RNA sequence: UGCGAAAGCAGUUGAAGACAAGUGCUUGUCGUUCGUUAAAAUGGCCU
């Protein structure tokens, strides 16, 4: 995906209706990007527990 | 008030001033002088509820029989106590979790 | 060295001096030494309250601070020693916690924007690399 | 889709739509915009004479009502105004502030 | 849509008397003009308040603003200008060159930035990308990001020159929310082609260390959101 | 999982298998955080190309 | 509780009387009043 975006970037700029054409890519990235703060919060709680029983 | 409308039960605060138990329950027959009872709430209340919360001693509902032998007192903890008015003997019914 | 720094910190905490912040910000502290100090050398609720107040004020006055010793101190403090910090119900301590909350809240919104900018820069690096190669 | 693209957050949002469907009147906070539906963007005129698509008002818009294709009622937190779209002129304004 | 705007068919106060009194007031008399105008409107607050709806007529604003500019083109501006800058129904036409005329006076310039409606994106972005860096940069950034669409901001950054874009980039790199959104808009504006390798590498390192510190601060945020057989004991009797 | 950590955090210091489960779920969470960050970066790249 | 976008930002719960329990004293309670903007009676849902 990233190599396609890098190599064919100018053609993607030139073509219009890019969200409509790449609609699946946008939503697939949106879900993963939206899940981030909950993952970070769970990471911090699990850091607390693991560090506590590691010191103990 | 009973279903036929001949009997009236009421619970009153005045027993707190005039007696050891806080509240008094009085059953009066309206149209004639057949039925008259007055008893403190402390006799009805269980001996386990003094250590508990105030929900266990708070009367949220009452019902009185048409023939006047039964008095159902429902509390804020979800317990229904049916009192035989002739002998002041209670029976406990527990299904309700809330009031 | 580390024991001398810990003794100086204990003396400054006892004397309520302002040098406790300098002792915490000193580069003599390493992470196992920080963990050992937090595990053993703190028993006084007043001294723990004082070090928490100065750490929280120092972080709140500059949340986007490149140094990591003070955030490491706060992280290990909250990780290992939270319960007595909840028991301390001082109003100024609660207000300081709210201020530190307000200072640290903003970086949550920033992180998606910074990640997007980093992605754009990553594309620009690899496009320049392709243009240079061919 | 019309992207928000703002750091501006406001619950004072009203919409109106012309009966032929050509124009959408979007009142957001104090601004009021006219949008061409076909482009779903802001209305721009080639002549660009006596046609302003954005209205800036005194307070936040509560209601936008497009009566006919001509008359546009805008209720703010202070005043209730009628604007004639063809004329581009405010017919009359009333003071709703003491209520 | 075609017929819009093209029709061929065509506490009360005396605004005309207020304009006449302000005209009779002498030029460069800031105190006299302010006293007469505030006595005519009869509201105490220097900034605009919800009380005075009736002054919001536009022709009064045009005549008063023209009289102010004529009277104090060279002299110091009165508090009447401050009140009109706080006023929401400011005329659209004056904002085209408002900032240039009030650039010399910093207090009135800042008041126009933070309160005056309809400051155009042209002069706003030009003043932001100016090399003055007089710490009003945050207010200008907040103003443009709050009041203008991301597409239009990007389109105006397309028009703006590459050198000032560069200078803004090393200014950010040397050294926040509005700043990062602005940097994202600047990157979108310059696009694929034009960015130098050295500046790009410094910007990459800067963004990487900010990502590290941001993730660290979110961690701290969520941290704040977070019978033996034989026992030998002493007895006192 | 967070409610589990809140209620039963003391039994981690005793039970060894729960510690192994916590460490495995930690590694999985780190992998998913990396995937989410990568998706956000590609979303920014897509925004640069679309705009 | 007030305002505000969801984020948040400021702000706040005082008295009086009566009763109970413990031991005149202490503490709690309120089918009490006045003032401020301010868990737990083995007890789970029909055919």
């Amino acid at each position: 995906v990233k190599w396609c975006l890098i190599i064919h970037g100018g053609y993607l700029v030139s073509i219009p209706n890019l969200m409509s054409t790449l609609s699946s890519l946008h939503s697939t990235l949106k879900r993963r990007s939206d899940l981030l703060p909950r993952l970070l919060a769970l990471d911090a709680r699990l850091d607390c527990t693991i560090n506590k029983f590691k010191t103990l | 008030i009973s279903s036929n409308g001949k009997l009236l039960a009421h619970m009153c605060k005045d027993v707190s001033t005039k007696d050891h138990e806080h509240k008094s329950i009085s059953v009066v027959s309206l149209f004639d002088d057949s039925v008259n009872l007055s008893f403190p709430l402390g006799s009805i209340l269980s001996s386990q509820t003094q250590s508990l919360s105030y929900n266990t001693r708070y009367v949220s509902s009452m019902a009185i029989d048409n023939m006047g032998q039964q008095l159902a007192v429902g509390f804020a903890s979800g317990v229904i106590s049916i009192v035989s008015l002739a002998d002041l003997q209670i029976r406990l019914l527990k299904w309700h979790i809330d009031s | 060295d580390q024991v001398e720094i810990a003794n100086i910190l204990s003396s400054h905490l006892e004397a309520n001096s302002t040098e406790i912040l300098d002792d915490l910000m000193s580069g003599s502290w390493t992470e196992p030494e920080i963990k050992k100090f937090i595990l053993t050398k703190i028993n006084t609720v007043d001294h723990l309250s004082k070090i928490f107040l100065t750490i929280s004020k120092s972080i709140t006055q500059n949340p986007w601070n490149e140094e990591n010793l003070l955030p490491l101190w706060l992280k290990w403090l909250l990780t290992l020693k939270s319960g007595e910090l909840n028991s301390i119900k001082d109003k100024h301590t609660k207000k300081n916690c709210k201020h530190l909350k307000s200072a640290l809240r903003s970086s949550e919104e920033i992180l998606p924007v910074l990640l997007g900018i980093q992605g754009r820069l990553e594309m620009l690096r690899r496009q320049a690399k392709l243009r240079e190669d061919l | 889709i019309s992207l928000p693209n703002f750091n501006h957050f406001s619950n004072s949002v009203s919409l109106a739509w012309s009966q032929d469907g050509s124009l959408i009147f979007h009142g957001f906070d104090d601004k009021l915009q006219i949008l061409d539906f076909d482009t779903f963007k802001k209305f721009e005129s080639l002549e660009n004479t006596k046609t302003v698509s954005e209205f800036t008002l005194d307070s936040e818009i509560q209601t936008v009502k497009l009566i006919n294709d001509t008359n546009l009622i805008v209720a703010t937190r202070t005043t209730l105004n009628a604007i004639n779209l063809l004329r581009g002129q405010v017919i009359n304004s009333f003071d709703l502030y003491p209520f | 849509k075609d017929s819009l705007g093209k029709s061929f068919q065509v506490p009360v106060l005396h605004c005309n008397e207020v304009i006449e009194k302000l005209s009779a007031l002498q030029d460069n008399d800031i105190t006299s003009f302010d006293d007469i105008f505030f006595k005519e409107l009869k509201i105490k607050e220097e900034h605009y308040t919800e009380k005075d709806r009736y002054i919001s007529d536009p022709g009064f604003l045009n005549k008063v603003l023209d009289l102010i500019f004529g009277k104090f083109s060279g002299n110091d501006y009165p508090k009447t200008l401050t009140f009109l800058l706080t006023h929401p129904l400011f005329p659209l036409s004056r904002t085209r060159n408002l900032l240039s005329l009030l650039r010399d006076q910093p207090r009135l310039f800042k008041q126009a930035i933070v309160t005056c409606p309809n400051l155009p994106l042209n002069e706003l972005l030009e003043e932001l990308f100016s090399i003055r860096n007089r710490e009003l940069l945050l207010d200008i950034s907040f103003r443009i990001l709050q009041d203008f669409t991301r597409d239009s901001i990007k389109q105006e950054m397309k028009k703006l020159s590459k050198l000032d874009v560069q200078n803004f980039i090393e200014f950010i790199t040397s050294g926040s929310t509005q700043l990062f959104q602005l940097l994202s808009l600047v990157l979108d504006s310059i696009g694929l082609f034009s960015l130098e390798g050295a500046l790009l590498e410094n910007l990459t390192l800067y963004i990487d260390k900010q990502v590290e510190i941001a993730e660290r601060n979110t961690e701290l945020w969520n941290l704040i959101d977070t019978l033996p057989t034989y026992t030998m004991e002493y007895l006192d009797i | 999982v967070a409610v589990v950590l809140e209620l039963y955090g003391n039994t981690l210091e005793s039970s060894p298998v729960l510690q192994e489960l916590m460490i495995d779920l930690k590694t999985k969470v780190r992998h998913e955080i990396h995937k989410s960050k990568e998706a956000q970066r590609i979303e920014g790249m897509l925004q640069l190309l679309t705009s």
Side-chain angles (χ1 to χ4, degrees), chain A residues 1-53 55, chain B residues 1-13 22-99, chain C residues 6 15 21 24 27 29 32 34-35 37-38 42 48-49 51-56 58-88 90 92-93 96-134, chain D residues 1-43 45-46 52-59 61-99, chain E residues 1-12 19 24 37-38 41 47-56 58-62 64-70 72 74 77-78 80-95 97-130 136-161 165-192 194-195 197-200 202-237, chain F:
Chain A
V1 164
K2 282 182 296 190
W3 274 122
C4 285
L5 296 179
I6 290 165
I7 290 174
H8 300 286
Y11 179 63
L12 258 64
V13 170
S14 78
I15 193 66
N17 297 114
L18 203 47
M19 64 183 73
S20 169
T21 58
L22 299 194
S23 180
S24 48
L25 190 60
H26 283 300
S27 59
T28 312
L29 294 184
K30 273 282 179 63
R31 304 183 314 172
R32 274 285 173 194
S33 63
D34 280 2
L35 283 160
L36 174 72
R38 193 74 71 233
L39 288 172
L40 287 180
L42 182 62
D43 208 13
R45 317 288 184 117
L46 202 46
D47 262 347
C48 294
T49 59
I50 287 186
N51 292 350
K52 260 175 282 199
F53 71 74
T55 54
Chain B
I1 297 169
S2 58
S3 312
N4 49 1
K6 283 152 191 42
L7 283 160
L8 166 65
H10 53 103
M11 184 207 65
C12 298
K13 174 139 287 186
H22 295 89
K23 289 169 274 289
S24 62
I25 301 170
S26 176
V27 180
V28 181
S29 176
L30 311 166
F31 291 94
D32 59 39
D33 189 74
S34 60
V35 176
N36 189 359
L37 307 86
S38 177
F39 51 93
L41 182 57
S43 59
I44 306 305
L45 278 176
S46 302
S47 175
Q48 320 169 1
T49 63
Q50 300 84 339
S51 57
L52 301 172
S53 297
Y54 186 49
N55 296 358
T56 59
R57 289 155 308 183
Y58 184 83
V59 175
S60 58
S61 47
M62 293 177 70
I64 177 69
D65 209 355
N66 292 10
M67 64 184 73
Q69 310 162 359
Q70 288 162 118
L71 180 89
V73 171
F75 294 97
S77 59
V79 174
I80 299 147
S81 301
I82 301 193
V83 177
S84 168
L85 285 192
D87 291 331
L88 277 299
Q89 308 269 29
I90 66 164
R91 194 211 321 191
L92 290 176
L93 296 174
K94 314 173 172 189
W95 184 86
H96 296 252
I97 296 166
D98 218 350
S99 294
Chain C
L21 178 59
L24 293 174
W29 282 110
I34 297 169
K35 188 182 287 186
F37 181 86
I38 296 169
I42 180 64
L48 189 140
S49 172
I51 62 170
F52 178 61
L53 287 173
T54 178
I55 288 178
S56 167
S58 59
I59 296 192
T60 312
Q61 63 84 30
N62 193 5
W64 293 77
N65 202 359
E66 202 294 339
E67 61 86 20
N68 53 17
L69 292 174
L70 281 60
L72 192 58
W73 269 102
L74 188 74
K75 168 186 165 223
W76 283 117
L77 197 83
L78 292 159
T79 309
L80 268 296
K81 298 296 289 183
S82 66
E84 69 275 16
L85 183 148
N86 296 115
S87 68
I88 298 314
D90 186 74
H92 295 88
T93 301
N96 189 359
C97 288
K98 174 152 159 213
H99 298 346
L100 182 61
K101 214 75 170 175
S102 66
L104 293 176
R105 184 184 43 73
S106 64
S107 76
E108 182 46 286
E109 321 285 0
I110 299 299
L111 190 58
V113 182
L114 282 184
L115 282 175
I117 291 182
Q118 185 176 2
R120 296 173 203 179
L121 284 170
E122 192 294 344
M123 168 174 317
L124 287 201
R125 295 195 294 91
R126 293 166 71 183
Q127 280 178 178
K129 183 175 174 66
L130 286 178
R131 180 159 323 158
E132 190 276 331
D133 189 359
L134 315 175
Chain D
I1 183 170
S2 163
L3 294 174
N5 292 352
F6 283 170
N7 294 91
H8 189 52
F9 286 167
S10 158
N11 279 334
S12 303
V13 174
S14 182
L15 307 169
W17 208 335
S18 62
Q19 302 270 60
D20 55 358
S22 66
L23 290 183
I24 307 170
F25 310 95
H26 187 188
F28 175 60
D29 202 356
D30 43 358
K31 305 298 177 186
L32 173 70
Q33 315 152 41
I34 307 184
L35 279 57
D36 168 47
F37 174 55
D38 291 331
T39 60
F40 211 58
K41 304 191 62 44
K42 207 172 149 48
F43 185 41
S45 43
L46 178 58
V52 65
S53 307
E54 186 158 359
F55 293 100
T56 293
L57 308 173
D58 43 359
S59 304
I61 296 89
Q62 311 300 298
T63 80
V64 174
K65 304 268 180 184
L66 185 81
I67 288 145
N68 301 303
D69 278 1
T70 76
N71 285 358
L72 187 68
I73 313 294
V74 167
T76 66
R77 284 191 42 248
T78 68
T79 54
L80 170 81
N81 322 314
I83 299 154
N84 200 298
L85 293 187
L86 310 175
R87 310 270 306 285
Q89 216 192 4
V90 181
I91 311 300
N92 47 354
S93 289
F94 292 109
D95 200 53
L96 300 187
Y97 189 73
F99 314 110
Chain E
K1 170 182 172 189
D2 310 304
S3 292
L4 185 89
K6 294 181 183 292
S7 168
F8 47 80
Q9 217 289 326
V10 163
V12 64
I19 291 155
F37 179 82
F38 281 130
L41 61 83
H47 52 287
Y48 181 83
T49 317
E50 294 266 30
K51 300 289 96 176
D52 49 356
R53 284 91 64 196
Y54 303 97
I55 293 90
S56 301
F60 192 32
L61 266 293
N62 312 130
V64 162
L65 268 178
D66 294 331
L67 188 153
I68 287 169
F69 283 168
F72 318 98
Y77 278 122
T80 303
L81 183 63
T82 71
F83 175 75
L84 297 199
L85 287 194
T86 58
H87 181 69
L89 298 193
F90 198 83
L92 306 189
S93 65
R94 323 308 313 261
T95 68
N97 314 120
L98 172 43
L99 285 184
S100 54
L101 309 169
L102 282 71
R103 197 156 301 125
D104 53 318
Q105 307 147 67
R107 294 300 310 92
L108 302 193
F109 177 65
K110 184 178 184 293
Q111 197 86 319
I113 289 298
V114 301
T115 52
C116 170
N118 306 288
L119 289 182
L121 189 46
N122 296 297
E123 293 83 3
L124 272 182
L125 269 173
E126 182 65 26
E127 182 36 60
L128 169 79
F129 277 96
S130 291
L136 303 178
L137 188 152
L138 287 176
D139 304 5
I140 306 178
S141 69
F142 174 64
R143 175 77 202 247
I144 59 171
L145 283 184
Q146 172 191 64
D147 288 357
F148 293 103
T149 61
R150 192 168 192 284
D151 186 9
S152 62
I153 301 171
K154 182 174 72 68
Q155 285 299 107
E156 182 65 26
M157 292 180 183
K158 298 282 189 177
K159 193 176 315 305
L160 191 146
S161 160
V165 164
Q166 187 142 280
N167 297 129
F168 173 69
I169 292 168
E170 70 272 14
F171 184 62
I172 301 306
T173 314
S174 69
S176 296
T177 297
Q178 273 61 56
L179 282 188
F180 289 135
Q181 299 176 246
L182 273 189
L183 195 152
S184 76
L185 274 168
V186 161
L187 271 190
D188 289 357
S189 172
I190 62 170
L192 305 175
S194 56
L195 189 66
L199 183 67
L200 185 142
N202 306 138
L203 190 55
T204 305
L205 297 186
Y206 174 75
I207 289 298
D208 273 292
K209 71 171 71 66
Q210 302 303 30
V211 167
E212 182 65 26
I213 188 175
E215 176 172 351
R216 202 266 313 278
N217 283 359
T218 59
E219 174 154 48
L220 259 54
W221 166 260
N222 295 121
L223 287 198
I224 307 174
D225 280 325
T226 295
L227 192 141
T229 69
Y230 195 101
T231 63
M232 185 180 288
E233 306 180 18
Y234 290 105
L235 182 64
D236 45 350
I237 63 170
Chain F
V1 160
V3 178
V4 161
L5 294 182
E6 182 178 1
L7 291 190
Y8 294 113
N10 315 120
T11 62
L12 276 296
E13 293 179 353
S14 173
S15 173
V17 287
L18 286 192
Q19 289 171 355
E20 287 213 339
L21 286 183
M22 287 308 141
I23 290 163
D24 211 359
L25 192 153
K26 184 62 151 23
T27 60
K28 297 283 215 320
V29 160
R30 298 296 323 177
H31 282 217
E32 299 311 326
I33 291 183
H34 169 239
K35 298 159 76 170
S36 180
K37 289 179 170 181
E38 281 313 283
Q40 180 75 64
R41 285 148 181 162
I42 305 176
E43 191 173 325
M45 285 161 45
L46 273 187
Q47 284 197 2
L48 193 145
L49 283 183
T50 46
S51 52

